Amino acid sequence: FRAIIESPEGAGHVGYQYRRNTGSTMRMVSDVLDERVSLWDFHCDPSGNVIQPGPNVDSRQYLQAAIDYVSSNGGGTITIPAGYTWYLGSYGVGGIAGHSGIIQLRSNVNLNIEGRIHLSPFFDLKPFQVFVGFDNGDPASSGNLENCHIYGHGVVDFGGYEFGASSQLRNGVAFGRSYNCSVTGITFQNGDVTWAITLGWNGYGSNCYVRKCRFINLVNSSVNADHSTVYVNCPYSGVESCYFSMSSSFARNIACSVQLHQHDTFYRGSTVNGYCRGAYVVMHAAEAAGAGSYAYNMQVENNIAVIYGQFVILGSDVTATVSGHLNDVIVSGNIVSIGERAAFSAPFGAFIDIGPDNSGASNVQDIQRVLVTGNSFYAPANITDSAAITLRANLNGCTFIANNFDCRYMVYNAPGTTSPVVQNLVWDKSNVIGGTHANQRAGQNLFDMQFASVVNSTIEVQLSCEDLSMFSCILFPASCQLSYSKITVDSAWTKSMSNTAVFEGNQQAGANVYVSYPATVNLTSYNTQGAVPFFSTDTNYAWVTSAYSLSINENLDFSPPATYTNKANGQLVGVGYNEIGGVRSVSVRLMLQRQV
Amino acid sequence: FRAIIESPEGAGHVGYQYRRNTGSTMRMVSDVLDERVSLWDFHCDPSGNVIQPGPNVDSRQYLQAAIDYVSSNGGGTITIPAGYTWYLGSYGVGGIAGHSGIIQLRSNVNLNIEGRIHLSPFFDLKPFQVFVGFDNGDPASSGNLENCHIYGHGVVDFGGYEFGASSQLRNGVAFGRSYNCSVTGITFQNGDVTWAITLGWNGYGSNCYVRKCRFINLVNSSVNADHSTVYVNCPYSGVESCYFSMSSSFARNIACSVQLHQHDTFYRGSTVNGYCRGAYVVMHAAEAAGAGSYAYNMQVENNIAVIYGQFVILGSDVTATVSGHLNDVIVSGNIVSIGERAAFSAPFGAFIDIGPDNSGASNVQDIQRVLVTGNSFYAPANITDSAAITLRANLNGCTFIANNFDCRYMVYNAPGTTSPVVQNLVWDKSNVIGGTHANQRAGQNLFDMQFASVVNSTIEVQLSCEDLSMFSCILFPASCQLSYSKITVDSAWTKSMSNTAVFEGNQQAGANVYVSYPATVNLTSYNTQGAVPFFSTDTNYAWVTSAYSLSINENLDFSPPATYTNKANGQLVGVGYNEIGGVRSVSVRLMLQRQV
Amino acid sequence: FRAIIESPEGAGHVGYQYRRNTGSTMRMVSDVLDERVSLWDFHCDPSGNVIQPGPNVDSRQYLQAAIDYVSSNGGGTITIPAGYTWYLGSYGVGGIAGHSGIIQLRSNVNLNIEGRIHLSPFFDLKPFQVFVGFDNGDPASSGNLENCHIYGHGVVDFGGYEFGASSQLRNGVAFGRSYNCSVTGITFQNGDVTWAITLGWNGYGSNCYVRKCRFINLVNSSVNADHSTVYVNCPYSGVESCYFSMSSSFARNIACSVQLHQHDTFYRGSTVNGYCRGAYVVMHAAEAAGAGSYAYNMQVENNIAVIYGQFVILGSDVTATVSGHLNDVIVSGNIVSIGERAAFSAPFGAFIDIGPDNSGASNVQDIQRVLVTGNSFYAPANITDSAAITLRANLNGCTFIANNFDCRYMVYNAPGTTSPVVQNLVWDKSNVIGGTHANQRAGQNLFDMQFASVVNSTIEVQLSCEDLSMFSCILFPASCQLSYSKITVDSAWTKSMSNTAVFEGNQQAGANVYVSYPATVNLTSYNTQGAVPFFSTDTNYAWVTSAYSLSINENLDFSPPATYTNKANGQLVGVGYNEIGGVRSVSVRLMLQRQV
Ligand SMILES: CC(=O)N[C@@H]1[C@H]2O[C@]3(O[C@H]4[C@H](O)[C@@H](CO[C@@]5(OC[C@@H](O[C@H]1O)[C@H]2O)O[C@H](CO)[C@@H](O)[C@H](O)[C@H]5O)O[C@H](O)[C@@H]4NC(C)=O)O[C@H](CO)[C@H](O[C@H]1O[C@H](CO[C@@H]2O[C@@H](C)[C@H](O)[C@@H](O)[C@H]2O)[C@@H](O)[C@H](O)[C@H]1O)[C@H](O[C@@H]1O[C@H](CO)[C@@H](O)[C@H](O)[C@H]1NC(C)=O)[C@H]3O
Ligand SMILES: CC(=O)N[C@@H]1[C@H]2O[C@]3(O[C@H]4[C@H](O)[C@@H](CO[C@@]5(OC[C@@H](O[C@H]1O)[C@H]2O)O[C@H](CO)[C@@H](O)[C@H](O)[C@H]5O)O[C@H](O)[C@@H]4NC(C)=O)O[C@H](CO)[C@H](O[C@H]1O[C@H](CO[C@@H]2O[C@@H](C)[C@H](O)[C@@H](O)[C@H]2O)[C@@H](O)[C@H](O)[C@H]1O)[C@H](O[C@@H]1O[C@H](CO)[C@@H](O)[C@H](O)[C@H]1NC(C)=O)[C@H]3O
Ligand code: NA
Ligand code: NA
Ligand code: NA
Ligand code: NA
Ligand code: NA
Ligand code: NA
Ligand code: NA
Ligand code: NA
Ligand code: NA
């Protein structure tokens, strides 16, 4: 009996019944212990003696054996024990080798990481993906990963190692073709990686989530080509209540927190500091296989960010046989700033960027039905390169309502670069334009409409303080066609501006252009006593449907007209009043109106 | 000794002290095992031998025995083990039998569902409620359920069985008169049910929540009368970060994701696909016993939905002795579309519906202080039956600010049906009206004001592109009284519209109606050289307080007035200028204004 | 052998191998039991015999021994078992004694509270902090607490004891200088305390969170000086999805739910009932040591509240050597009401308060770049003391867009109290002003601008129903300077108001003041037949740049001007038309405009 009890089957001979309940199962101790499983149950030598983890022990084969075994019983949760650091020091074998994989995840096998998982110096200057849910080196030939959850209070530490070559890839968790998989509570830290977590593969997958995770210092070298902390490449998936922080200079130029690349995906309630970019919201044609060629129902909400480049980047593109489309997007409730930096020292600061494709093409995009509402954006006064929207590629629609934008430009695109075709750009009057950059705008147009064309668009400019340094509130170069559009500049804070709206090709004269803006106009009257006409000296008002006075009348003996219409020769005309006769000459501030 | 050790009391004779710590308790192994409990501890035959679960084993009595026992010790958490499917194959007995109950929940007894719970074919064509927290067949005589949490990565599978009769009810979890109860992480799938989860009973309960659950394919037949996935019938309760999906045709006509039926309830951060409706926000008088007759502090925020009918339905109603009231509601940050379907093939598409009671009555409602803000709504161009709001019952107030609505109608109610009494409907100018349905609106009014009366309301219409197909921007039939209201149509994109605002009963003449809209007006002048009057040929402008030109003047020799007032006979009059004399005749586009 | 097996080392001699897997570790039963730990492992007498908890057992030393031991092994999670109430009945010793501490938390040692922790009557009329993460009585000399998480379905019950003296402090969890610490799922109840949870210390700490907790009845006496349920005093931290309830009268006068006192902090998705205040958003100079002197990236979103005082209070202040600054704040998506109460029976009702410092100073604040958007606020009609914003201290900027405010005042400050200096106050026209207080406003100004000065501000007043009881829509006393500002009153619902905008110092005449509002004006014409001038009888319009008719013309034989300008003597003048000659005299409602 002593032999049996001291043997590995001993617990299988000690009887147990829950709480001495006579109605409970008559079990053995081993049965109850078998209800849970930990890395300790596989972390042993060939004789079955436990091995202590440590920097000189490679725990990989043992964790893999645990996963393989639990998988074979239909699943369960393997605990990675608290109070220990478990080092990984070799590559996995088989289907994950094509992904530089360390551990292969399996369906229905959850990992409760309570301790620490650390990469050993074997991985220095090498590629790696720590956990991989693909089962084949070719993702198109891979099976699915289902019902795999990684959670706990533990840590994945990437060892601080730099990339060896820019062409290498590194990742924390690649769920693969992933259905009902998640990471919750985990801290990913101290690395130079491409991604921390990737969900899905080219639209294959569903219901994958990253929640309450921390991502700290995951870019550290000039070799790192690019970094996006979470890449969401399956629909009905997203990122919620996470924390993302970088301290490296390199991160300010290369790092983004999230990629939302399939329909019905979201990024909410998260805090970002030290990154270049917040989130891309994109449909890549090359990623359209599993869920279609449309990214729709895309949500970026209630995030807090300090970034150095752009908050949300919108795009779509094409391959030889597939066209990507982006539509039905909402960006709301976010509070975002460009961190302290010199002008032009990081990628151009923006709340929204309409980004050209990876080859720089600006004529492949199909982006529409986007609502940007209830956000606040701030950039310090010295940051010349800061805009509410950098509109750098073709845009089929974007709507701004009730935001507060406090930066250098509202709408911007650089002259002599791309010439976007713009449709359905709507900037509602409820967007509040801050004053941080007042007096910084010499030579600059607040809305700098450097486009090929603008149609079906609305720009309602409302200032909230004076900035007499700017060249204009809104400027259209002669190369920009403008039609079926409404462009207004409210008069408040504009009395002393030389230029308010500027149409360098006289585009405001278009049949279906609806415009109003302030201007200074010189008038002269006829001599007649009584009701008497006043006429503008200049003849550039053939497009004006009505105008009205924004100036007081300092005179007693006469008054100019309150309101004006035009004449065929381009003069304004109105009827004033001469109490006493005489030719009058006045300079008046008018609101010029066309069809409004 | 061998006898004792091999007996069910054996573990109670093997000593243990935590980590050989001399300061720790000297325990027995059974004491430590007794800290946890699983279904295995009760899933046994009358001799105490464990029984394997499977499709031919009814696990119900064993799970019930586990719950009953743990309850008797003041509570705890019972694990339903991973790697097994536990089938239920009979009805429960006692107080839950009146609810077609399977398992009776008890207070302080949590269920950690890691494996799968599946209904056996016993339940085919039958009613059932899988988990029931009532302790009496009459809910009014039931005790409370407190501190009961169901959570884990597991699954409740309803076996795919159709309803046997439309009058049957099916549910997953009915917490009952439930205080501090929740479901977290669970997947409910593969059924034809009435509800997945119900919280509370007629206002009795508090602090009940559904979080991070999935609801997949829970309607599958034409027999199913109605489906709402979660019914929230207790205050201080709600649904967060859930996923709801249906694939059946029937679901598009009958299924809603959530009912919010008591005060201080919420629905946030969730994704819905394949349903008829998003959420009802309702006070039923028949449900007012536990928490009063007011549903207030109701929140529907930051959800993503593809539906076929209406997103949010508002209502309240009465019984013989109780009147229900709905107020203090916020609907914000949601992105919603009507999915691809033929016009009129599902219930009328809407973002907000003001829904008549279950008997069709439209004169029992008391709905006010609702804020709908920062949402986006889209319906494909062919969907005639799509509206920002279908206003089908009496409304005491609803406020729309800063939404983007891209569908056929803005405000709609069908003529020849109900005649709501409308008060305090506010449609702010910051609502952006999309252009998807441009050119589809022959014979249709964008705001079709088919009401008995409208008072204290604001409609500020702002187009963002042309749609010359529509009959009018806004139309009031002669049967609709209109008073103490502001109705404006911005001129942008309206120059070529025959009708902008239409008042078929000349209601715009009311003493406290404030209106402005564009119109085309024919004028003739007197012969006089110099300042000269122009008068309208028609006499239907007795209500106009001022008008101004929206047209250019192609003439050199004269100009019509910039601005006009009226005369007692209903003509417009203004003072223009004849450089040379002559009777003039012009047709001008004017902004007509009344009291604005 | 029997001796060994019955001894505390017995489990260390019974062999086990997971699921009889020949590839698994050959362990002993004690090894597997050692993977978990509970209070039972330390809750024993000096001979190692287990002690049952209860109201006459002080569990403190045992829980402390458990924490101290697990800490020494590098951490883990200690379960506090379900089905038992564990009483605490003495103070801790050492570093926590200076904090009236009971239990000392240690790094990496989590507490899974499943049962109940209750304070014994030892603590009646005494100070206490139940769990303390400081390790020194002087916080400036304390070490850090890291990686400490408290979670579960359990309860902390404060025994209902009143404070003994107002100067005492009581707390539930003081994490201290806390990095990666959290409380999740716990119910804190039945107390008279200062705080339930405090995060951080004077800016030291990071990544601390309170999620899914309940706070119920934590103020019960007149002795309690002040209460804030969660104080967030470290950056990158916040409160999400919590429930806060009070029933005591005292709570309505003293209690706030949250303090956000460091940068990158948030309060979201929570429900509050019975409190005085929602949240303070503040930078105290005295708290600036660990994270700097700026509170920025502050977020209060998507909360539901019934309160009696103010929802969000903004402030910053100074010490002898440090100045605090508050900027980059967003308050969005909240639905808030003042609960039923008599006027003036609790602190002044407000959605936003700009609060003077703790000494009452209103000239130390530096608050700017605040966005308040998409919120709804309601106060019952009798509550005179209710305002969208009580602006009681110096303000450098606050922006309101797309809110719905239904209360007595929009902007308020009490006359004869503080005289704030106001800059960059922006009230967009998209704010909807409710009608609950219509007819209650005798003697009152809707926007009561009781300030020293206002600059760079925008107030666009838009009514949505009539209230002829109010004295004015907006009033500036003569003591308030006004410059570089835009003040407009839309005409809708204003026709019968005697006063719309009132400038008691004629401030609207300022060179850079842009204003428009309705007024009634008496005019007389000259006798001349034909085009004929009309002039105002009064001479107080020297500041008017244009005016236009808001009245119809009941006359046939003449018409007054549609539009007017002014003259040097302060008369309005315009050109009307006398079909037949005669001196005319009319009273007209005009929109008066200055520079707009
Ligand atoms: C499936 C569902 O919940 N449908 C919703 C309707 O519920 C009733 O619920 C329907 C609601 O009335 C409407 C609200 O819109 C209408 O909109 C609300 C209706 O929406 C359906 O989605 C609900 O009434 O009214 C609005 C206000 O006037 C108006 O604006 C709008 O335009 C209208 O359309 O929304 C849904 O459609 C609701 N439907 C569902 C499926 O939730 O109809 C239900 C049909 O299933 C259900 O009635 C049945 O069940 C009750 C309850 O069953 C008894 O009690 C329980 C406790 C025991 O366990 C059972 O064994 C049984 O004894 C039966 O009495 C009734 O005869 C059945 O037809 C809804 O009942 C409520 O169910 C909840 C959840 O279980 C209970 O907590 C609550 O006590 C029940 N309320 C009442 C009054 O009985 C019923 O409200
Ligand atoms: C109960 C509470 O937190 N009240 C809030 C006030 O806190 C002080 O906190 C109050 C805040 O000052 C005000 C802010 O609004 C006012 O608004 C802020 C005040 O709001 C109360 O709600 C807080 O100061 O100032 C604004 C800015 O100028 C202005 O806009 C506004 O109009 C003003 O009204 O908000 C609340 O009212 C705060 N009150 C509460 C209860 O949080 O007052 C507190 C009273 O309890 C408290 O002071 C006491 O406690 C400190 C701390 O105790 C020592 O240190 C700790 C670490 C040890 O454990 C203890 O044993 C003890 O040695 C005592 O020094 C002091 O003498 C007591 O009166 C607040 O102190 C801060 O407590 C937090 C949380 O524990 C600490 O992390 C922090 O270090 C403390 N800060 C300071 C400067 O001591 C105090 O700020
Ligand atoms: Na590869
Ligand atoms: Na890139
Ligand atoms: Na990137
Ligand atoms: Na029943
Ligand atoms: Na129904
Ligand atoms: Na329904
Ligand atoms: Na102290
Ligand atoms: Na205080
Ligand atoms: Na307080």
PDB file of C-alpha atoms and ligand atoms in Angstrom, chain C residues 226-228 254 256 259 280, ligand 11:
ATOM      1  CA  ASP C 226     -16.753  65.541   3.408  1.00  0.00           C
ATOM      2  CA  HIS C 227     -16.943  62.485   1.143  1.00  0.00           C
ATOM      3  CA  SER C 228     -15.572  61.571  -2.270  1.00  0.00           C
ATOM      4  CA  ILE C 254     -21.402  66.678   1.093  1.00  0.00           C
ATOM      5  CA  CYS C 256     -19.108  63.454  -4.540  1.00  0.00           C
ATOM      6  CA  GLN C 259     -12.090  63.244  -7.962  1.00  0.00           C
ATOM      7  CA  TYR C 280     -14.285  67.247  -9.555  1.00  0.00           C
TER       8      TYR C 280
HETATM    9 NA    NA D  11     -16.218  66.027  -1.745  1.00  0.00          NA
END
